[PDB]
Amino acid sequence: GVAFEPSVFPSFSPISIEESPKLSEFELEEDQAIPTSLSQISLTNAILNAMAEG
């Protein structure tokens, strides 16, 4: 509550979210948008957390 530090957070794309190790453990629908939807929602969620912390 006085000082700060410059951190960084990585964001995966649509091709990296479906190529994970334990990605098939969840009941995800392959017919609908699940890989591209989870990657696009993570970019807006990480930008909101970085703007609030900044």
Binding site: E25, F26, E27, L28, L48
Partner: protein, 128 residues
């Protein structure tokens, strides 16, 4: 043991729950003690969590992704989670009437956005 963390406050936070029934995209499924890993999308329904006895708290979730872990953990991440007593019956009729008249009346994303708002308002008004 639930983890209902929204984007404004924490509901469950710590693991101190028993049963929880949340409306998902497929059906109205409910988690028990240690549910299996079935991370599915949550629809705009009522997410009630029974606390031991009959001390359940009806939380009208706006839709999210009810993720379940394999170690007796249920993470219900939603955008908005309000109770059933925090909504009025007179003010809810104004939004449902304006979305029905605006549907199929223009172009672009004006007609497509009115159809999703009319379906979510009709499900919340029938559970009073």
């Amino acid at each position: 043991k639930v983890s209902l963390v929204a984007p404004h406050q924490a509901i469950f936070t710590n693991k101190e729950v028993s049963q929880v029934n949340l409306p998902a995209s497929s059906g109205e499924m409910g988690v028990l003690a240690n549910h299996v890993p079935t991370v599915e999308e949550l629809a705009p329904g009522v997410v009630e969590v029974i606390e031991s006895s009959g001390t359940a708290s009806k939380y009208f979730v706006s839709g999210g992704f009810a993720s379940i872990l394999p170690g007796s953990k249920l993470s219900i991440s939603t955008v908005e989670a309000h109770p059933l007593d925090a909504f009025s019956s007179e003010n809810i009729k104004s939004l449902l009437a304006e979305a029905q008249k605006n549907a199929s009346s223009a172009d672009e994303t004006v007609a497509a956005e009115a159809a999703i708002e009319i379906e979510v308002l009709e499900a919340l008004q029938a559970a009073v």
